[PDB]
Structures are given as structure tokens and as C-alpha cells.
Amino acid sequence: FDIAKYPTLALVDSTQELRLLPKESLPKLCDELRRYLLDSVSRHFASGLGTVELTVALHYVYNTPFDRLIWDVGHQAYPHKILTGRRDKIGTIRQKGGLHPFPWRGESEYDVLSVGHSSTSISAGIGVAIAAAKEDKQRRAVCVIGDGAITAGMAFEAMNHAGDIKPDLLVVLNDNEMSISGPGTLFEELGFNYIGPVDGHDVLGLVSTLKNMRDLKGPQFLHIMLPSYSKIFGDWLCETAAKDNKLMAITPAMREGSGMVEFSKKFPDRYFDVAIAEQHAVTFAAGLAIGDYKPVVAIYSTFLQRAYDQVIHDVAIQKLPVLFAIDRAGIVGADGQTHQGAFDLSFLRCIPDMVVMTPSDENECRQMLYTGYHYSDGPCAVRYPRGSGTGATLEPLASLPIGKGVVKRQGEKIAILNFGTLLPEAAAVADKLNATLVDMRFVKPLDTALILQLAGEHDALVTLEENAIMGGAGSGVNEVLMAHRRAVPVLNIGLPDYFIPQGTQEEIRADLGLDAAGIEAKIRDWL
Amino acid sequence: FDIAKYPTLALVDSTQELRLLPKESLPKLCDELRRYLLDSVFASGLGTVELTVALHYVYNTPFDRLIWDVGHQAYPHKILTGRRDKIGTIRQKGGLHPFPWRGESEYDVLSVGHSSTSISAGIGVAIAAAKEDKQRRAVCVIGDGAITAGMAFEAMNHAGDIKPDLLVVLNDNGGPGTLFEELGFNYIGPVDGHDVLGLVSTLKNMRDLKGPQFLHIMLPSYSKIFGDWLCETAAKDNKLMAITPAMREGSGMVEFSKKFPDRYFDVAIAEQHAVTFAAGLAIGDYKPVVAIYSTFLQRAYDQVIHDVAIQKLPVLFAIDRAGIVGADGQTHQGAFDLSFLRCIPDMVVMTPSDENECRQMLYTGYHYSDGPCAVRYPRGSGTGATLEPLASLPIGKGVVKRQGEKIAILNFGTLLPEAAAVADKLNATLVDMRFVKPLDTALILQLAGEHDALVTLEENAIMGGAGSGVNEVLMAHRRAVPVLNIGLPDYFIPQGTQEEIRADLGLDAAGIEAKIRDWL
Ligand SMILES: Cc1ncc(C[n+]2csc(CCOP(=O)(O)OP(=O)(O)O)c2C)c(N)n1
Ligand SMILES: [Mg+2]
Numbered sequence A: 001f002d003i004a005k006y007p008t009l010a011l012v013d014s015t016q017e018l019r020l021l022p023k024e025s026l027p028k029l030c031d032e033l034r035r036y037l038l039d040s041v042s043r044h045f046a047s048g049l050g051t052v053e054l055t056v057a058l059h060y061v062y063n064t065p066f067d068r069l070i071w072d073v074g075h076q077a078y079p080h081k082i083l084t085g086r087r088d089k090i091g092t093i094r095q096k097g098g099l100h101p102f103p104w105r106g107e108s109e110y111d112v113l114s115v116g117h118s119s120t121s122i123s124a125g126i127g128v129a130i131a132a133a134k135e136d137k138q139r140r141a142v143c144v145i146g147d148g149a150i151t152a153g154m155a156f157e158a159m160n161h162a163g164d165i166k167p168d169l170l171v172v173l174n175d176n177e178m179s180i181s182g183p184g185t186l187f188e189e190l191g192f193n194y195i196g197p198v199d200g201h202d203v204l205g206l207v208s209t210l211k212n213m214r215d216l217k218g219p220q221f222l223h224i225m226l227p228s229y230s231k232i233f234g235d236w237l238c239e240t241a242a243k244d245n246k247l248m249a250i251t252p253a254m255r256e257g258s259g260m261v262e263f264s265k266k267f268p269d270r271y272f273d274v275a276i277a278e279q280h281a282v283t284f285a286a287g288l289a290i291g292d293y294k295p296v297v298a299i300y301s302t303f304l305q306r307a308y309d310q311v312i313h314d315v316a317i318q319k320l321p322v323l324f325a326i327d328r329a330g331i332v333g334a335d336g337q338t339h340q341g342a343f344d345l346s347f348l349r350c351i352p353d354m355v356v357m358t359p360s361d362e363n364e365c366r367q368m369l370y371t372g373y374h375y376s377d378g379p380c381a382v383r384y385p386r387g388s389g390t391g392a393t394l395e396p397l398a399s400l401p402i403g404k405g406v407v408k409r410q411g412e413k414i415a416i417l418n419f420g421t422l423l424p425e426a427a428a429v430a431d432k433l434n435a436t437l438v439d440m441r442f443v444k445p446l447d448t449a450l451i452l453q454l455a456g457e458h459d460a461l462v463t464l465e466e467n468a469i470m471g472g473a474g475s476g477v478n479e480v481l482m483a484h485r486r487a488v489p490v491l492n493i494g495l496p497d498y499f500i501p502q503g504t505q506e507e508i509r510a511d512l513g514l515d516a517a518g519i520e521a522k523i524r525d526w527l
Numbered sequence B: 001f002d003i004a005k006y007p008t009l010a011l012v013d014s015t016q017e018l019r020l021l022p023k024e025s026l027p028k029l030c031d032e033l034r035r036y037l038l039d040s041v042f043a044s045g046l047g048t049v050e051l052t053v054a055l056h057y058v059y060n061t062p063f064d065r066l067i068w069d070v071g072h073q074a075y076p077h078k079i080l081t082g083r084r085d086k087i088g089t090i091r092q093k094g095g096l097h098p099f100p101w102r103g104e105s106e107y108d109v110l111s112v113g114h115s116s117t118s119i120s121a122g123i124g125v126a127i128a129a130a131k132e133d134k135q136r137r138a139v140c141v142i143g144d145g146a147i148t149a150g151m152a153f154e155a156m157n158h159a160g161d162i163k164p165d166l167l168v169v170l171n172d173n174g175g176p177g178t179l180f181e182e183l184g185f186n187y188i189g190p191v192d193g194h195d196v197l198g199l200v201s202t203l204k205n206m207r208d209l210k211g212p213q214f215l216h217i218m219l220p221s222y223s224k225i226f227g228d229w230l231c232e233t234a235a236k237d238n239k240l241m242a243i244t245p246a247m248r249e250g251s252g253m254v255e256f257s258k259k260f261p262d263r264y265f266d267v268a269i270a271e272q273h274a275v276t277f278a279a280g281l282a283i284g285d286y287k288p289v290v291a292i293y294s295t296f297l298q299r300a301y302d303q304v305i306h307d308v309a310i311q312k313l314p315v316l317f318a319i320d321r322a323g324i325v326g327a328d329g330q331t332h333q334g335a336f337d338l339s340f341l342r343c344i345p346d347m348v349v350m351t352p353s354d355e356n357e358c359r360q361m362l363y364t365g366y367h368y369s370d371g372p373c374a375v376r377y378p379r380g381s382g383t384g385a386t387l388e389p390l391a392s393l394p395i396g397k398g399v400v401k402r403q404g405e406k407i408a409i410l411n412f413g414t415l416l417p418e419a420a421a422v423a424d425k426l427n428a429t430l431v432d433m434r435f436v437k438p439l440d441t442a443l444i445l446q447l448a449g450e451h452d453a454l455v456t457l458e459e460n461a462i463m464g465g466a467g468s469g470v471n472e473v474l475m476a477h478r479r480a481v482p483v484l485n486i487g488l489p490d491y492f493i494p495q496g497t498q499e500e501i502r503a504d505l506g507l508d509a510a511g512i513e514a515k516i517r518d519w520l
Helices: A023-040 A046-050 A052-061 A075-092 A121-135 A153-165 A185-189 A203-215 A229-243 A261-266 A278-290 A301-316 A344-349 A362-374 A423-433 A448-457 A473-483 A505-511 A516-526 B023-040 B043-047 B049-058 B072-080 B084-089 B118-132 B150-162 B177-183 B196-207 B222-236 B254-259 B271-283 B294-309 B337-342 B355-367 B416-426 B441-450 B466-476 B498-504 B509-519
Strands: A068-071 A141-146 A170-174 A193-198 A220-224 A247-251 A271-273 A294-300 A323-327 A355-357 A380-383 A406-409 A414-419 A436-439 A442-444 A460-468 A490-495 B065-068 B138-143 B166-171 B186-191 B213-217 B240-244 B264-266 B287-293 B316-320 B348-350 B373-376 B399-402 B407-412 B429-432 B435-437 B453-461 B483-488
Touching: A023 A046, A023 A052, A023 A075, A023 A203, A046 A052, A046 A075, A052 A075, A052 A141, A052 A170, A052 A203, A068 A075, A068 A121, A121 A141, A121 A153, A121 B271, A121 B294, A153 B150, A153 B271, A170 A203, A185 A193, A185 B177, A193 A203, A203 A220, A229 A247, A229 A261, A229 A323, A229 A362, A247 A278, A261 A271, A278 A294, A278 A301, A278 B118, A278 B150, A294 A301, A301 A323, A301 A344, A301 B118, A301 B294, A323 A362, A344 A355, A344 A380, A344 A442, A344 A460, A344 A473, A344 B337, A355 A362, A362 A380, A406 A423, A414 A423, A414 A448, A414 A473, A423 A436, A423 A516, A436 A448, A442 A473, A448 A460, A448 A473, A460 A473, A460 A516, A473 A490, A473 B466, A473 B483, A490 A516, A490 B466, A505 A516, B023 B043, B023 B049, B023 B072, B023 B084, B023 B196, B043 B049, B043 B072, B049 B072, B049 B138, B049 B166, B049 B196, B065 B072, B065 B118, B072 B084, B118 B138, B118 B150, B118 B166, B150 B166, B150 B177, B166 B196, B177 B186, B177 B213, B186 B196, B196 B213, B222 B240, B222 B254, B222 B316, B222 B355, B240 B271, B254 B264, B271 B287, B271 B294, B287 B294, B294 B316, B294 B337, B316 B355, B337 B348, B337 B373, B337 B435, B337 B453, B337 B466, B348 B355, B355 B373, B399 B416, B407 B416, B407 B441, B407 B466, B416 B429, B416 B509, B429 B441, B435 B466, B441 B453, B441 B466, B453 B466, B453 B509, B466 B483, B483 B509
Parallel strands: A068 A141, A141 A170, A170 A220, A193 A220, A247 A271, A247 A294, A294 A323, A323 A380, A355 A380, A414 A436, A414 A460, A460 A490, B065 B138, B138 B166, B166 B213, B186 B213, B240 B264, B240 B287, B287 B316, B316 B373, B348 B373, B407 B429, B407 B453, B453 B483
Antiparallel strands: A355 A442, A406 A436, B348 B435, B399 B429
């Protein structure tokens, strides 16, 4: 740290020291903190730059870490980490072993809530504030939420509840944060005292306003002013819409991530961004299907968690033919635990009347989208990872036989049953071990006849998937075998029973034993 | 039927004769329909008589799409859409569904049961209708409780953005309109919801308006065991807090709400906020208990995963209506919580087999500080088990109930009396497993080494369920002992009494014995 470059930032290693600075020094501190961020974080974080003055004001006014400051998701919280003891580590953000992208409870007493999904801050802040009142030590609570995050249903539920029971909570609406990857009437109607919009870049103005609002009772609201699978999906949307008036596609505020930018411009009448609203995304699709359109819900595995009840109740129970294009399935890399696509094979396959498909390459991905798009008896899901595929030829489209796998190699003694994009690693292993290899294609319905044939011809089976082992695709294979009283041992390879930490997709797969070398070692150790 | 008592209603078994009535007969029609409901079948259905008459009189149903949010507000709808001769079978095995059900009538646009789905679906129907370009109209009816749900706000906010031709009727049982105006609706009301002629005139106008329109009209059960336990714990522990998403009576919380009002939080129909609010209380070093039905917990799954499990916060989930729920049918079954909770890291999942176990497990999860715990139990009465003094149960350990030979039955939950009869008949070993997660791995492997076959029993989907986790342990240890997994089949379970639906699915002693004998 170059104390001569940042002589004011040099004085405030702790927020206790920050609170001792003369107020007159705070604009210079904000300049230095903005320069230090630019000089220090690797190439993205415009909302971090835009929240510098707010962050200084908040830690200057609130007695953190005793008073509780809860950040909603976003790079708005980078300056926060710099001021709470992690200045010299800020260049490690998102690296394996480095700082978390967002506040993480285990990382600092100053991180009240681990975030990553959006819109959780107000709800948690109401709990913290109710607890603070009962504790009766005059602890205060503030949360900072971006304008994207405030579109989610659970933020409305939280604000409505705050209007009812009237916690002593300050909510700061930060228009600098987008929350992904006049103005006060609504919040007043929900029961808040509303101030603003104020200048979010006036550190002294914010200190004065926050000092007053921190002392008020009840709910307070301050308003401050080579191809990726995603590209494969977006290309397929465009090809399909060009020939079929029925296709409609929906994203809950993840147009760029899900690969839909070109589609949104070529087919604007087929494209719906419903904001950060996964639950509405799904039930809106159910309504389009009742209307005899063919909706595709583009949604990340991790965010689909939040729309589970709409998948079960508003789609599967109705047998409506909605197609789910599930991106960021499996290991997602840099965003770490809060974002992994770790559970969708488990939580979707226990639901009746769901078809669940796991392509092993980008051709299979297209074939499965096509198959699910023309499958009319009920909903279909196709899940695929962040990142590139194998370079597979994109073959002419044809519906795949439902619930049938594909034999890739005939070997002996061991059969490997692959679900999804780890197939090239399993192919290397099966050559090395002279094993049988099968690309299962379908997690549900499973190819039971192929499972029984494999079990009748090998001493042991291996299942492979980029999902939790517990309840996952391989667990489904186990169930078929046991139902047929064929107790042939199966090694279920997949994600272990802990939340998967950050790193490159490649290095985290290797750490989990999900490359060819890891898979081979697991088989040998188990045999 | 009884033409004498209802001489206007008698002539309008379908909406086509309904629309042939002169306006002047609709008031008498409404009186007759209300009396018919009183005689043939709750309060919310009585309350929607006039609205229902007005809607079907003005809208060209079933071509125009009318969507009902959940509630017995839809009983009159079924009487006017050709099903009045069946209204006496509602909620019975083989009878009419309690709520509109797509397969039951072309007048049922959306199957409902969970709340707050009507606006979202209505926006899709309305967007489809505009693209169809055949002048089809769309209208939905939502209750004042259902509009508290986060997905209803998401839908209203999207309606304000894309401006579909949809009428939302708030069936409400400054000013109230400002919120809906700010979300982007044209707001009318509040109006008299029992002036049928006034509603016909208003609906006629608003059906013809473009864009988003908003019309505002004016032995103890396990639940009791849980509520009693909350009271006893809060009496001696200031940290206890209990949360319900608007299901106070069903979750057994009435007395608790009256004795501990300062520790009781009804968050409205807001499962998502219920869970993350609990996470905040736990961060604040209180001990929250979230009371929630299995089927509704589906809607808070992301908050369980991201705001509780990833945080390692020690929230207690008291999961009622687990397993087969009986009369409410498919939309309400507690069919999946053992599957969707056990794949989540750092979750403890407990399945008590009687009232005493239920209390022991609530106490155990309440005093477990390393992460969240869930205790799931069915609707209905327990066995009469003696309530023993409370102490924490050793984590991930099951109990041997009977020693036999050849077969071992591994029970998760309240079908244990049935497993016990079977175990006697077959001279099978019987184990009460207690924990779905973590499993008693040591015991599973000992049972497999001592028997030719295992049987698992749970009142949850077989797919992904507790017995599926036993399979996984055996496979991980490269064992070769087959396991019969007994549980809920892979279809949504229809309505009936709990006893008769369990019998149908083979989850009584007789059906379990038969499944074992057939499989061997
Ligand atoms: C997600 C969800 N949570 C809880 C329920 C339980 N529930 C059924 S009806 C109701 C209240 C709404 O009905 P009401 O206000 O009594 O009058 P109505 O709309 O029938 O006229 C609730 C909370 C539900 N159906 N869905
Ligand atoms: Mg109501």
C-alpha cells in the first residue's frame, strides 16, 4: 500500500478510525478510494465506483460492525470491503482462495449477510431490526438495495411486512446498482417514510441525511440517484422464431447471460424480460401456453430455485408444455457458492410429468431444445453449463426418442453412464479402462431397458453428472436397479455434499475430481 | 333439481341461457344461487355470487378467459358452468375438484390451489389473446390475501410495463387505488360487490377498455403438538420466535399467537419473506421457527438454500401437511420435501414417527446451532404415544424396533405402525430411521450385512426421497443388497380421505406386505 499516494485512505484502516476523521476530509477520502479501486481491481465494477460516497457515509455514521449494514447483491459492495480490512486483498476478488465477489459472513464481522442472489437484504434487515429492538441495546440496521433487486417479489413482500409491523430499518435504494450478473409514492404506499431522490455523490450531504434517518423510528426509505451454450441457445431461438409464430421466449432480467441479445432485436415481439422475477417468469409462460403459444423460459439453474413452486404447480400439475432452457448448470466458476447450478437434476426429477434432458455437447443441446419444443404432453427442461462446448457439428434437427440413451463405446466389466457435458472426460476414462460408455441424454424418463442391459453385462456401473450426487441423475439409476431387484453396485460421481467454492470452472472441476484423471482415480479407489 | 326453491337458477344450468336472461332477473338469480350454496355444500363462495353472475353474463365465456385465483370464491362459478348437480361431491374421492381444474371443464382456464397465480397467468393469456387477434378478452379474480404474494406484485409490475388487455378484479373482503395506479393499472373502485346490476354495467365498460384494468370490489393433531411445544418453549426462553405465512390456524398457532403476540409473526401469504425474515432474526441471535406446509415450502426453496443453508443459520422448519393431505388433492400434497431438502448441503431433515418423537425432534432442531433443521409431520392425529421428557436426539441415529431375519424395514416417519404390523407378520427386522439427513450410515451397512433385502418406507416421492438416500449409501459402499423403496408414486396424488388414499397407494399394512411379497 502506497501511503504517499493515498494519504487519507491510509488513515482509515478500520471504520473506528474512519469515524474519527474530520468531516471535511471525507470528499478527499472518497476521491482516494475511487482512485485506489481503479488502480487495484482487475478487469465490470461501475456500481462499485458509483457507491464510494454512500459507503463512506454509511460507515462514518453507523457504528459498524455493531450496527448492521446489509448489502443487497452487486459490486456496490467493493468499497465496503476496502474499508473493512480487505484493502490489500481486493485484487484477489473472484480468484480461487481469494475474496468473495460479494459480502460473505465467514469473511468478515462486517459482512452481515452472504448475498449473490438478489433482493434478500430487506427481508433479512427486517429480521435484524426486530431482533435489535428486542435486544434493547440501541443497535441500528440499514440495508442497501439496487433498483433491479427491488423488482423481485420477495422485496415487495418484505416492504409490505415492514409497513405492517414497522421495524426500525433504513432501506437505501441505490440507483447506481443494477443487481445482476413522483418516485416515492410506491414506497410511501407500502408504509415507508420516503426521502429523496438525493445526490448519491455528495458525501457530506449523505452523512447529514443518514445521521438523521438513523435516529428516526419505523421504516425509513432513502432514495439516492468456440460458441458458448448460451449463444447456441440464442441462435436456436432465432432459427425457430423465423419459421414458427408460436415461439415466445422469457428471461428474468438475464438477457445477455442467457445469450438472447440478438434474439431480442430480431424478434422483439417474441421476447419478454420480466425483470428479476423468476416466479412470474414461469407462470407468465404457463399463461402463454394456455393461450396456445410455445413459451421458452430461459433461466439459470441457481435462479430456477426461486421459481420451483411455479414449475410444480403452474406447469407440471397443469401438464403445460413449457420449455425450460437452464443455463449455468453445474459448476459456474468465479461467482462461487451462491450461484452454482448444483441441484436442478435433483429438484426437477422428483416432480411428476417433468422431462429432464442433459446434453453432452452443443449439437445435443440443439436436438434437445428442438425435442422439448415440439413435445406437447407436458414440460421439458434442457440444462447446460456456462462456457463453450466441444466444437461438435450442428447436425440437422430431429426429435430425439424420449427416454433413450446412446451407446458410445462397448467395453467390458464396467459401464459408465454419463449425464451431460462431462462426456469427453468419461470418454478418455472409458478408453483407458476399456469400459462401456453410454450418453444417457435423459435424466427423466430414464432409459430403464438400457440400464438393465448394462447391469446384466457388467460387474459394476458408474454414473456421472455435474449435479449433486444426493438425489441426482445417478441416484435415479440406483432407484431403477433396486426397483428391479438388481443390486449391481453403482459408483455415483457428481458434486459432493457441500456448497462449491469459487475458481475457474476448469480448476474447480479438477479439484472435485471431475476431470478424466479424477474420474479414473475415483473408480479405482471404489473398486 | 328443486325447481320450486330456485325457479330462475333452474333455467340457467349453462352460461348460454344465463346470457338470455333480461338484466332485471339477475338480482333474483343471485338470491337463489346464494340459497342453493347454503343448502348443498365456504363464506367466500357466498360472497362472490353477484360477481360471478355479472362476469359470466358480461364475458363471452368460455371463449373469453376468466381466471380464478384460489379460494372457495369459485363455488358459484361451477354451479353456473354445468356442474351444479355435482356440487355435493366437492373434495370427495372421485368428486369435483375444490377449485377450478383444467381437465374438469372448458370453463376452468387455470388449475389453482396455491394462491396468487391468477394475474401472472392472466397476463400470458391476455398477451396471447392480442396476438391471436380474434378479440378474445381476459379477466382474473384475486383475493385480498392472495395479492400479498411476491409473485402477484411481480405480475402487476410487468403488467404496468407491457400493458396487456387484462382486467384484474380484486375481491376484497391517499386511498386504496394509489398502489395499483403506481404499478400501472387504471383503477376503479372500491365498488359494491353485491350490486349485480352495478357490476354488469361496470364490467361491460371495463371489458372494452384497453390495457391493464383494475376493479376493486367490496388424540391431538401434530399441529396441536407443535403449537403446544412452541408455548412451552417460549414460556422459558425469550429467544423463541415463530413465523407463519398466513396459516396460523392450520399450523396450530392460535393459542401461541394469543399468549406470545410479541414473538409471533404472520407475514401474510409470503413464504419467501417468511424464510429470509427468519434468517435475519437468527443473525440477530434469536431462534426463529418457520411453520410452513410442505407444499408451500416449495415456494421458499431459494430462501432455504441461499438465505439459510449457505449462511449456516440455525433456523428451525416445522413442516406441517407432510405426505398425503387428503381432501385438498394434487395442488396441496406434501409430496416432495424429503427429496428437495436432502440434496441441499448442511440441512438436517427429521421425520418423527409419533407425537413424542415429534416433540423430541423439535427440541433437537431448536437446540442445534450448526445449521438449519427441518421436522416434517402430516396433517392429522398421532398414535397416543406417551410424551417423554425432552432431550436432544443423537444426530443421524436410528432406533431398532424389532429384530427379525431375512428382511429389514427402514421407516422414515408416521407409517411406522404399518411397518410394525408387517414386520410382525413377516418376522422382519424393523428400524425407525428418524433422520433423512444425515442418515445412520453405520446402521444401514449393518442391516445390509445381516439381511438378504432391505425395504424403505416414507410418505414422500420415491424419486429422490429418503429411501433413495439409503440406496446411495449402499452403492457408495459397493454393497449388493437390493432395496425395495416404498413411497409416493410418480404422479400427483388426487383427493380423498387420507386413510383411503394411503390405502389406494398401498401405504397401509396390507399394501406394504403385498409390495414386499410381489417384489421378492
Ligand atoms: C402460496 C399459498 N400460501 C397459502 C395458501 C393458503 N390460503 C388459501 S386461501 C387464503 C386466503 C385468501 O382467501 P380469502 O382472503 O380468505 O378470501 P377469497 O379470495 O376466497 O375471497 C390462503 C392464505 C395458498 N392457497 N397459497
Ligand atoms: Mg378474499
